[PDB]
RNA sequence: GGCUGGUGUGGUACAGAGAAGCCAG
């Protein structure tokens, strides 16, 4: 398995060493052990943040402000979801929305900065919504960049080109925490869960939260061109695709986002008959 | 490329999806 072909983290991984030289706020979390080999504590919220807010600014010329209590993203598996919407949209301007920004509106703040994407980015939470508008501010992205304050991740809302979302991926909180693991001696996650609670959960998990959007897609049809929703459980890929072919969408598609060991899948469907389905 | 169950993740990670993969009806 591959990131995708245009990532620019394919088969380039960030050399620790040189960013914990580079940047003294990011080599406090780097350490280096005897063999020679770097690694970070995934675990650690502190770091996490630390490397993502590193490589966005050395890779990326952004400098966001994201809080240790909300989801801090990664850069590798957000830029997968960015090469994949691209091949979806055949890259004029284009026009997109993010369904719950996140309080690093990474989404928008990639597809502007790479591809000068206008968005309309949405968040349902205080919290996200005041770090999202200051992290569109501070890089004088407000003109491409329009984040809003919203009651429910929708698109039911007060021609565009595509939408993107990270769903909350669960449906309570024993699945927030993984406790649904088969034998008890399974092998712990290298990663955080630093989400809140309407990042990462919602009424039906996945599932119905995607369902809701497609419903939402049936009113709309052509007001957008593509829709897609990332998928965090394997799973949710079958139902979803099913309940797409009861409701008579005439193109739908899927991928896979590949990083690490922890892979994503998303899903694309659109009303039109001109576009190209990857 | 399908689908249904055991196996498989102590780490350049990716909200670990019991995932990719493996075996078999």
Redesign the pocket.
Known sequence: ?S?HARNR?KDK??????LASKYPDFKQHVQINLNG????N??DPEA?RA??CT?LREDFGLSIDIPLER?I??????LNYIHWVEDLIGHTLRRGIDIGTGASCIYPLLGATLNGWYFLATEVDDMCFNYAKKNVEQNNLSDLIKVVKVPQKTLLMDIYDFCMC?????ANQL????V????????????????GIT???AEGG?LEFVKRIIHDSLQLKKRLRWYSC?L???????PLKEELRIQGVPKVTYT??????????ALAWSFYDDVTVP
């Open positions: 398995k990131m983290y991984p960030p050399d620790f060493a040189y080999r770097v690694s970070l995934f675990k996490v490397l993502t490589l989801l993203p990664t850069v590798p598996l957000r990270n769903p909350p991926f669960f699945e927030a925490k993984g649904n693991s088969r034998n008890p001696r399974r092998p712990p996650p290298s990663s955080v869960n630093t989400g990042e990462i959960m996945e990332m965090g459980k394997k799973c949710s890929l079958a896979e986002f590949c990083q690490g060991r922890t892979m994503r899948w």
